[PDB]
Amino acid sequence: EHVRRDLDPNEVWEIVGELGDGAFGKVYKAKNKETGALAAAKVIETEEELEDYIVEIEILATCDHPYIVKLLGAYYHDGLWIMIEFCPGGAVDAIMLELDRGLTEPQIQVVCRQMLEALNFLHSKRIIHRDLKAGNVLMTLEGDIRLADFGVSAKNIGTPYWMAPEVVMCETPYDYKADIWSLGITLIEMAQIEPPHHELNPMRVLLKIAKSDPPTLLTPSKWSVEFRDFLAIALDKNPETRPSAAQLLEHPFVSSITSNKALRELVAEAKAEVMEE
Amino acid sequence: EHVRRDLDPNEVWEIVGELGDGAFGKVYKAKNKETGALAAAKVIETKSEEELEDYIVEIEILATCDHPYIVKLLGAYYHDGKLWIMIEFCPGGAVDAIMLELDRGLTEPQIQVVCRQMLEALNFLHSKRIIHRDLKAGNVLMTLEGDIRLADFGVSAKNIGTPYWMAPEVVMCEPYDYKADIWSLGITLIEMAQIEPPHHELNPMRVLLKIAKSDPPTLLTPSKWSVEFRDFLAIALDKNPETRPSAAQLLEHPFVSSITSNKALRELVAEAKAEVMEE
Ligand SMILES: COc1cc2c(Oc3ccc(NC(=O)C4(C(=O)Nc5ccc(F)cc5)CC4)cc3F)ccnc2cc1OCCCN1CCOCC1
Ligand SMILES: COc1cc2c(Oc3ccc(NC(=O)C4(C(=O)Nc5ccc(F)cc5)CC4)cc3F)ccnc2cc1OCCCN1CCOCC1
């Protein structure tokens, strides 16, 4: 593996805080002793699990894109550290909570447009995410999005005649359509704070999703028709018919976006509310 | 038994023949130097370290599958970079090899015996949360007495993100997954009836799309076969996993519920044994 394995982290970085006590684990905010560059340290306690994590770092090492979090280093000492470029805005779900309101349609358009640039880049590299949500999209001071994982997702027998129908569908081109659906749900999440069927517990929602009709926004007046159309085309149960990331890029909902000013305003607004006391 | 890794197998067994040069590898016929109980030796040269680790887990799965209709594991050794698997010798051989040597398919009484014993085998595995996933005539061995011994040759197995942001297709893909073997079982009966599996004229790449797009297949010439035969195939070949019947349920079906004798299979083994002596 490429991971630097001969340095104890204390020389390079010093822990300075905790950003969230969370299910994924503890993640600290650190500054480099030499250059003082801000970053986030993901500290994990493991086995073969370490070998499972090693592929995760290599996936991110090759995902060099403006709208994807930048990895600065990885070290393994004192029984594995991950350094990620510090995004001062934080996750969008944390921002929505701090401001106690949903995103505006202009702000959603910017987020939607930048995520499709990220997904089109990932899918072209035969990489799926499978965990798209507001919590996985961080914000910078400049108003840009940096996509993140916060886990161990992101992927990438028998004889043919005697196989079953379910086996051909589940096992083996058109497997990228899952992220497109998750993106459509995230837009509704950022608009209405909570995702569809949030009253239910995780076990029941799975059955609830399959039988039910595709979800739509609650207040159809407030949002544009192109928003509703973009959601309707994105939220399609049939994978074969589901449009790719490239097709949605040429859609009026995001095709005419040239400025990130709307998102830049949000980060400054959320930054100010934090100081209130 | 646990795989011996410091004892050479040559001391224990002596090779006396080759049974098949195959995709899996070389398979020899062996005799125990002490007792001479006869066995089959599957010898594999593991390419990597994780290749070996996958195979040793497979052996441990078979070590716990103690059932009359499943091949018995006798020993496992790893010396000189090769992996040895010791299995009880089945004189009948695989039924697909039998069909070729006899140049004909099995009869409905012979299929009923095979079907009943396989339904007993699958019910035993599924109760232990084990799927097979590679059911075919080549994986069904035969004994002198007329009994079935199920085998793998390949590999079976014993047994993410947030749901709200999930799609419909992931919900289907991601404890009612045991029905796959039932489908492979229904196809194997057609194979033993018609020698060749369904859609054998097509190339292997095309078969995957044909299985899904087409409706479930049925037998070609039903005149020889019963409606009870046709119904059992039709009920087994159901696309929906939730609706597919389990192994215990198919046992309570007249096609195999009224079987008390394995004489039909015993006749098949004796016929094939005699044909070998010819030329
Ligand atoms: C929780 O708050 C924060 C978390 C941060 C952060 O977290 C991580 C994100 C992803 C990974 N991923 C990884 O380590 C990996 C990954 O994500 N791979 C990956 C895979 C596919 C892909 F498309 C993109 C990335 C697994 C490797 C690791 C992280 F540590 C990274 C960078 N800056 C952060 C800033 C945060 O708050 C700043 C604001 C704080 N204030 C807000 C206001 O109130 C007060 C607090
Ligand atoms: C090719 O001919 C033969 C092969 C034989 C044989 O092969 C194997 C079967 C399974 C495994 N499985 C394994 O190594 C494993 C397995 O099967 N596990 C498993 C897992 C789950 C399960 F449900 C069942 C089995 C992987 C461990 C390994 C084997 F080596 C086993 C026993 N007797 C055999 C007799 C053969 O011919 C006798 C007749 C010859 N005549 C033919 C006509 O002309 C004259 C000669």
Side-chain angles (χ1 to χ4, degrees), chain B residues 19 27 40 62 85 87-88 90-91 125 132 141 150-153:
Chain B
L19 300 117
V27 184
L62 175 74
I85 301 172
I87 287 156
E88 205 184 44
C90 303
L125 282 173
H132 200 273
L141 298 185
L150 198 61
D152 194 357
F153 276 123

Side-chain angles (χ1 to χ4, degrees), chain B residues 18-21 27-29 39-44 55 58-59 61-62 65 70-71 73 85-94 97-98 101 121-122 125 130 132 135 138-139 141-142 149-156 272 276:
Chain B
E18 282 194 15
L19 300 117
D21 209 292
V27 184
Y28 305 98
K29 182 168 165 288
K42 209 216 177 198
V43 170
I44 306 171
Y55 287 41
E58 288 301 316
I59 279 125
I61 291 184
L62 175 74
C65 290
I70 304 180
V71 285
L73 176 65
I85 301 172
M86 290 330 280
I87 287 156
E88 205 184 44
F89 184 82
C90 303
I98 289 172
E101 181 86 322
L122 288 187
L125 282 173
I130 300 185
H132 200 273
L135 284 197
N139 274 330
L141 298 185
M142 296 289 322
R149 301 272 191 286
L150 198 61
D152 194 357
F153 276 123
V155 159
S156 63
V276 169

Side-chain angles (χ1 to χ4, degrees), chain A residues 131-133 160-166 170 181-182 185-186 189 195-198 200-202 206 209 239 242, chain B residues 134-135 161-169 171 173 183-184 187-188 191 197-200 204 208 211 244:
Chain A
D131 199 15
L132 285 198
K133 66 223 293 295
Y161 308 79
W162 300 269
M163 258 190 301
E166 49 278 27
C170 214
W181 174 277
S182 298
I185 300 292
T186 308
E189 170 192 18
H197 314 146
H198 71 299
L200 291 179
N201 67 338
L206 305 170
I209 289 179
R242 200 118 89 260
Chain B
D134 199 15
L135 284 197
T162 316
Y164 308 79
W165 295 271
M166 261 188 207
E169 48 279 27
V171 161
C173 255
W183 170 275
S184 298
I187 299 218
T188 307
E191 171 192 18
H199 313 146
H200 69 300
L208 305 171
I211 290 179
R244 207 187 316 262

Side-chain angles (χ1 to χ4, degrees), chain A residues 2-3 9 13 16-17 19-20 22-23 25 27-28 30 32 35-41 43-44 46 49-53 55-69 71-76 79 81-124 127-151 153-154 156 158 160-166 168 170 173 175-202 205-206 208-210 212-220 223-227 229-236 238-249 251-255 257-260 262-276:
Chain A
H2 75 134
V3 53
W13 312 81
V16 139
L19 301 117
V27 48
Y28 308 100
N32 192 340
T35 173
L38 302 178
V43 170
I44 210 57
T46 76
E49 200 172 63
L50 180 289
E51 204 186 341
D52 193 83
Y53 283 113
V55 311
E56 235 51 87
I57 279 75
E58 269 291 306
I59 290 186
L60 176 73
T62 75
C63 291
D64 197 334
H65 192 275
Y67 297 157
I68 304 296
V69 285
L71 180 64
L72 293 62
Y75 315 117
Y76 186 19
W81 287 32
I82 302 172
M83 286 32 202
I84 291 280
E85 206 183 43
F86 185 83
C87 303
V92 170
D93 69 339
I95 288 172
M96 269 182 305
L97 188 77
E98 184 87 42
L99 295 186
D100 189 26
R101 62 159 183 279
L103 277 235
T104 60
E105 186 170 359
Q107 289 164 330
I108 288 185
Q109 290 182 299
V110 184
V111 178
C112 182
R113 169 88 163 88
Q114 305 213 329
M115 287 191 304
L116 288 176
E117 293 272 337
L119 287 186
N120 189 94
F121 161 80
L122 282 173
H123 295 171
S124 283
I127 300 185
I128 41 180
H129 198 272
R130 290 191 307 191
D131 199 15
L132 285 198
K133 66 223 293 295
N136 274 330
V137 23
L138 295 73
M139 296 289 322
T140 53
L141 306 158
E142 300 87 19
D144 294 314
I145 290 105
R146 303 271 190 286
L147 197 60
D149 195 357
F150 275 124
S153 183
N156 268 289
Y161 308 79
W162 300 269
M163 258 190 301
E166 49 278 27
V168 308
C170 214
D175 319 55
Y176 305 108
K177 310 287 174 257
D179 288 341
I180 297 296
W181 174 277
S182 298
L183 176 138
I185 300 292
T186 308
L187 310 179
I188 318 184
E189 170 192 18
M190 281 171 314
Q192 288 164 162
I193 302 195
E194 310 268 356
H197 314 146
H198 71 299
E199 63 278 3
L200 291 179
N201 67 338
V205 52
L206 305 170
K208 223 290 188 197
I209 289 179
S212 42
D213 264 350
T216 66
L217 280 157
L218 287 175
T219 157
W223 315 110
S224 91
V225 28
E226 299 167 344
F227 198 173
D229 212 87
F230 184 93
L231 266 181
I233 184 195
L235 301 186
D236 178 292
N238 188 11
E240 277 180 294
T241 61
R242 200 118 89 260
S244 81
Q247 305 174 32
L248 282 18
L249 279 170
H251 186 284
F253 189 67
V254 286
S255 83
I257 296 286
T258 51
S259 183
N260 66 350
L263 276 216
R264 195 188 261 153
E265 300 174 347
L266 183 125
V267 165
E269 214 160 42
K271 209 174 171 214
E273 163 69 36
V274 169
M275 266 183 164
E276 303 286 355

